[PDB]
Amino acid sequence: RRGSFVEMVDNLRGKSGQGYYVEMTVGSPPQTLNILVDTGSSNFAVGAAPHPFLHRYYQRQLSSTYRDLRKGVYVPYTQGKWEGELGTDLVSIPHGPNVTVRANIAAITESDKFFINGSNWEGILGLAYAEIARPDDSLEPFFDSLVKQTHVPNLFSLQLCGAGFPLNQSEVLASVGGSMIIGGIDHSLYTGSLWYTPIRREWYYEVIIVRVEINGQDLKMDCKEYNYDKSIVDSGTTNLRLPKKVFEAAVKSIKAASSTEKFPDGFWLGEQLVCWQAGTTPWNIFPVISLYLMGEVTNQSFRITILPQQYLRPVEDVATSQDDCYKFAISQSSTGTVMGAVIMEGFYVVFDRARKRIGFAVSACHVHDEFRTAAVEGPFVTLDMEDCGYN
Numbered sequence: 001r002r003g004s005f006v007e008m009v010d011n012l013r014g015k016s017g018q019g020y021y022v023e024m025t026v027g028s029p030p031q032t033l034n035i036l037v038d039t040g041s042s043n044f045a046v047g048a049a050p051h052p053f054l055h056r057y058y059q060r061q062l063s064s065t066y067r068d069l070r071k072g073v074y075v076p077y078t079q080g081k082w083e084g085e086l087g088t089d090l091v092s093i094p095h096g097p098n099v100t101v102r103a104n105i106a107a108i109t110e111s112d113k114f115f116i117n118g119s120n121w122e123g124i125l126g127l128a129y130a131e132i133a134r135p136d137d138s139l140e141p142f143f144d145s146l147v148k149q150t151h152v153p154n155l156f157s158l159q160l161c162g163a164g165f166p167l168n169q170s171e172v173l174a175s176v177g178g179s180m181i182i183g184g185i186d187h188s189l190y191t192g193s194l195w196y197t198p199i200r201r202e203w204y205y206e207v208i209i210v211r212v213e214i215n216g217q218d219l220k221m222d223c224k225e226y227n228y229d230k231s232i233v234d235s236g237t238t239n240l241r242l243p244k245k246v247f248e249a250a251v252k253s254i255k256a257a258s259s260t261e262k263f264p265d266g267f268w269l270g271e272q273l274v275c276w277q278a279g280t281t282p283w284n285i286f287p288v289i290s291l292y293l294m295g296e297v298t299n300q301s302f303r304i305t306i307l308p309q310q311y312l313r314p315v316e317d318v319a320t321s322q323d324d325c326y327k328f329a330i331s332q333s334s335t336g337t338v339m340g341a342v343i344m345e346g347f348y349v350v351f352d353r354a355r356k357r358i359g360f361a362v363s364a365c366h367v368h369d370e371f372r373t374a375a376v377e378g379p380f381v382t383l384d385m386e387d388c389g390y391n
């Protein structure tokens with residue numbers, strides 16, 4: 001396997017809890033900012049005024065190429081909000097395609113619980129489609145601008161690399177967190193074959209899950225439950241989030257598989273860390289989890305399989321110790337399945353917008369042990385898969 005995108009390999013930093021970010025520049029002369037990669041939204045928005053958690057921000061008055069769109073944007077969401085002022089400017093990705101484009105930028109002037117202290121990022125790059133752009137679908141997303149203005153192919157791919165142990169702010173800064181390959185697929189980043197699932201509709205990166213197993217045991221729910229009210233691939237969410245009913249069934253099964261050790265309710269609620277003596281995390285007592293995805297061929301599916309090394313998220317201990325500690329990174333949702341960063345860390349994920357499909361292959365940087373690895377396997381004969389989609 002040759003790796004043909006060396007300029008873009010290792011261009012990300014960060015971690016599942018705080019997000020993965022890429023360096024970008026905005027304006028003339030270029031202003032460097034670190035930008036969260038978010039496949040779950042569609043706005044390019046950057047800090048544009050002082051904030052306690054920002055060491056730098058976009059200064060529109062210092063950019064000769066700034067254009068004011070004379071329009072505000074207000075983006076409240078469950079956990080937080082940002083608001084700002086729309087404009088356009090020249091934008092580049094230094095460890096990216098060697099192109100500069102004119103793109104929409106939301107200059108964030110006010111926010112609440114958006115910026116994260118010590119995350120090292122100063123804005124967000126929404127890579128999903130115009131339908132979910134704010135204030136409306138007339139605000140062309142960055143990637144749409146990039147493809148229209150250049151010869152960059154209509155595809156990007158993400159290798160998010162979890163360390164398997166905690167990183168502090170300085171360690172994030174010095175460590176490679178993965179790769180965002182703009183316009184292609186780098187074969188060095190994965191092992192085995194790429195398997196593709198259709199993008200059901202171009203808004204979020206929406207997919208259809210057709211079967212779920214815990215250690216090979218079918219969760220045995222009607223497959224519509226798995227996609228109620230949608231299933232998406234979202235680098236801007238930390239956890240694997242499952243619809244309430246599915247979460248309840250999955251947690252019951254995971255508890256049963258891991259029952260040789262009892263964990264407190266707060267662990268299963270994703271709130272409380274668990275710790276083990278250094279090196280002794282009992283990976284083998286925890287089950288693998290397989291999600292079967294609709295394939296491209298009629299009546300065919302494939303599965304992706306993750307380990308506890310994916311769904312147990314490393315965290316630092318609440319007190320000074322050499323223990324290995326984790327939070328359970330599967331949680332309930334009222335807005336559908338979210339395949340967040342902890343599941344993406346298992347895989348190289350190809351966002352093939354041109355062919356309306358998402359590819360999965362085992363990541364060359366997934367965390368595993370000597371006994372088990374993540375997997376992408378197929379095909380399986382699966383009937384009536386369209387019925388798994390929620391309307």
Ligand SMILES: NC1=N[C@@]2(c3cccs3)CN(c3ncccn3)C[C@H]2CS1
Binds near residue numbers: 038043114132236
């Ligand atoms: N993937 C996610 N991205 C957001 C993130 C905010 C901060 C980090 S990830 C931005 N967001 C959003 N929603 C609607 C329109 C625009 N953005 C929701 C929020 C949590 S989940």
